[PDB]
């Protein structure tokens, strides 16, 4: 259809959730409507590494350098790791073979794509199919972002 929206409340805090990926039109024409959104939640497929990851990295690069998103914070979720651990053996991460090395290399090759390091931060996470601590991570990141913005506005930071 169009844009899909969801509500959920956590720790007496209100959360608007905007799914927009189904628009299927020119992103640059309407992307500016979302200036001022507190956080951007990105999702990266790990098991789709052999190249889909080049496309995913290019898409990530574009979002960081958009002019509207100069000061917005990025929350990154790395999914499909349960299959990734087994896929390393069949397809090495070069396409020091290990789970930790591949995870660190992926994390570094993404996190090294924001020039204005001082302006914004890139929270990073590893998510599995089943985990109840994801919402706690979102809460603990959003509160930090809010505090940083309030401090920067008054000149204290």
């Amino acid at each position: 259809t169009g844009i899909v929206e969801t509500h959920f409340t956590f720790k007496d805090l209100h959360f608007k959730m905007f799914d927009v990926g189904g628009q299927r039109s020119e992103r640059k024409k309407w992307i500016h409507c979302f200036e001022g959104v507190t956080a951007i939640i990105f999702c990266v497929a790990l098991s789709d590494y052999d190249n889909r990851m080049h496309e995913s990295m290019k898409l990530f690069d574009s979002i960081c350098n958009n002019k509207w998103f100069t000061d917005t914070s990025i929350i990154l979720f790395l999914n499909k790791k349960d299959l990734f651990e087994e896929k390393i053996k069949k397809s090495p991460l070069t396409i020091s073979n290990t789970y930790e090395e591949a995870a660190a290399y992926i994390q570094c090759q993404f996190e090294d794509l924001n020039k204005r390091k001082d302006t914004k931060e890139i929270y990073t996470h590893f998510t599995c199919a089943t985990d109840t601590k994801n919402v706690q991570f979102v809460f603990d990141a959003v509160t930090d972002v809010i505090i940083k913005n309030n401090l920067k506005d008054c000149g204290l930071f």
Binding site: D144, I147, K148, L151, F157
Partner: peptide, 19 residues
């Protein structure tokens, strides 16, 4: 103390809002 950080120890001049 603030003057101590400003003058004698410029290396430890930094601010953080998480810790």
């Amino acid at each position: 103390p603030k003057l101590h950080i400003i003058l004698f120890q410029p290396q430890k001049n930094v601010v953080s809002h998480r810790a």
